[PDB]
Each structure stands twice: as structure tokens, then as C-alpha cells.
Design an enzyme around this catalytic site. Sequence first.
Site, PDB file in Angstrom:
ATOM      1  N   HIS A  93       0.820  -1.214   0.000  1.00  0.00           N
ATOM      2  CA  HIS A  93       0.000   0.000   0.000  1.00  0.00           C
ATOM      3  C   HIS A  93       0.853   1.262   0.000  1.00  0.00           C
ATOM      4  O   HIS A  93       0.310   2.360  -0.174  1.00  0.00           O
ATOM      5  CB  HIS A  93      -1.077  -0.013   1.111  1.00  0.00           C
ATOM      6  N   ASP A 116       0.069  -7.631   1.595  1.00  0.00           N
ATOM      7  CA  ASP A 116       0.517  -6.241   1.635  1.00  0.00           C
ATOM      8  C   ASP A 116       2.033  -6.186   1.828  1.00  0.00           C
ATOM      9  O   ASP A 116       2.556  -5.873   2.902  1.00  0.00           O
ATOM     10  CB  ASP A 116      -0.220  -5.492   2.739  1.00  0.00           C
ATOM     11  N   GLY A 166       1.531   6.740   8.719  1.00  0.00           N
ATOM     12  CA  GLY A 166       2.913   7.157   8.615  1.00  0.00           C
ATOM     13  C   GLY A 166       3.915   6.108   9.049  1.00  0.00           C
ATOM     14  O   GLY A 166       5.086   6.184   8.660  1.00  0.00           O
ATOM     15  N   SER A 179       3.195   2.961   8.237  1.00  0.00           N
ATOM     16  CA  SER A 179       2.978   2.055   7.130  1.00  0.00           C
ATOM     17  C   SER A 179       4.267   1.573   6.497  1.00  0.00           C
ATOM     18  O   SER A 179       5.125   2.392   6.148  1.00  0.00           O
ATOM     19  CB  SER A 179       2.207   2.761   6.016  1.00  0.00           C
ATOM     20  N   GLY A 180       4.376   0.268   6.281  1.00  0.00           N
ATOM     21  CA  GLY A 180       5.502  -0.309   5.598  1.00  0.00           C
ATOM     22  C   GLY A 180       6.692  -0.600   6.479  1.00  0.00           C
ATOM     23  O   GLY A 180       7.625  -1.278   6.028  1.00  0.00           O
TER      24      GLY A 180
END
Length: 223
Positions: free
Chosen positions: A40, A84, A175, A177-178
Site C-alpha cells: 500500500h 501487503d 505514517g 505504514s511499511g
Amino acid sequence: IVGGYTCGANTVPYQVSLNSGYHFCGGSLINSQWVVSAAHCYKSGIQVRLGEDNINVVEGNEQFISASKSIVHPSYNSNTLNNDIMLIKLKSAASLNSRVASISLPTSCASAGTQCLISGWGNTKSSGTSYPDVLKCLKAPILSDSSCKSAYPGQITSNMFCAGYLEGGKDSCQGDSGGPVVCSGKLQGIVSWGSGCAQKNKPGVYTKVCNYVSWIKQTIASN
Ligand SMILES: NC(=[NH2+])c1ccc(CNC(=O)[C@@H]2CCCN2C(=O)[C@H](N)Cc2ccccc2)cc1
Ligand SMILES: [Ca+2]
């Protein structure tokens, strides 16, 4: 990260910031040429920023390296965030040192109850918005799959796990994320999704990296 603590400069040396003019996602360095992040987080024009603590100040240990290619998982579903995960190749190899270091991929998954370290530059508020400039850290346990699915019925797949605290107050957030979830020295999770941040009975949901190790190893060997 909500309810966490300031990590300390370069104490999470596998943590990267993905930058497209601004920080927009975290990631994890897995060798000198490759970063793992969330699908994402995909976009073109990614610069990987290694060695960061304060993302708004040049402090002397950074390496800024453009991505040469990104590979979203072949089965990523953007409606559900199943699968994801994304790989990002650096145009030049990072110079590995004590402040810029890779994190080992899991040989085995982790079990419920294992404690993990989650980190990132995301929102620190459970209501409203405040973004830190230095890296934040959170110790959080993997929750049982049953408590995960009870919290999010019909939404959890075998490629996801929950971690955090059902009482709320401590969680990852937008923020982050990942970025990494590291347990017993292995990258077991990627910050993926959840309802709000740090809300009661709404724990964080993380990509289950151990399911992807074969795909990661084969993809990097052929790219
Ligand atoms: N641990 C947390 N509470 C938490 C929550 C969210 C995030 C950042 N991730 C996001 O914001 C992701 C990107 C797409 C929408 N989204 C979400 O988390 C949505 N809020 C819920 C959703 C929508 C579609 C599929 C799966 C989940 C990071 C951490
Ligand atoms: Ca910096």
C-alpha cells in the site's frame, strides 16, 4: 507510533524512510540492495533514506539512494490489503555500517505472545494528529489469531497477524505504514492496517512476513 518512546538515534538501523519529497512510509533494509515495505506504500519516484533519526535534519549518518525498481506482491489486493508486501531495489548498494544495517528474514514464523519491536515516524496521537521527527519505538506482543479475527471478523487472512494491546493506548498509526515489526531478531511483520490508532479492541494488523520468505528470496535473486 502511539504510546511508544523515542528509540534513540540509529538504534533501529534497519529502519528506512521512503521519501517522495517528504516521508510517506517506512521500510526495512534486508540486504545492501533491497528494502521490504508494504504494497500500500507503492508509488513511483521513491528515494530510500537510510541512517535516519530526525527526518527533518541532516545529522551526519544518512544515505539517500533512489530506487531503481519496485515489485508489488503478485497477489496484492488493494481492497483488503491481503498480501501487503513490496520489494524496492536501491540504484546503488547501501554502505552497511552500525547505523545502516539489514534485518534478518524469518526462517520460521513467530507465535502468539512473542514480544516485538515496532518503529516509525507516524502519528503519535490516538485522536488527532502529531507527527514526530525522530524515530519512535513500541514493544508489543503478537496477539492470538482468535483475538485478531474477533476484532476484525471476515477481514483477517492467513497472511496477516495482529499485535499490540486490546485495551488500547499503544499502537502503530498512519505514517508507520511499511515499517518493521521485529521479533527475536527477525522481520516478522510489516505495518499494514487497523481501525483508527490505539483504540480499544482494534489492534494493529501486520503483514505476516514469514509467509513471503520464499517469494522474497526468489524475487531478489532474479532482479
Ligand atoms: N496499527 C494501526 N492502528 C494502523 C492503522 C493504519 C495504518 C496505516 N494503514 C492504512 O491506513 C491502510 C491503507 C489503506 C487503508 N488503511 C487502513 O488501515 C484502513 N483504516 C482500513 C482498511 C482499508 C482497506 C483494507 C484494509 C484495511 C497503520 C497502523
Ligand atoms: Ca536526518
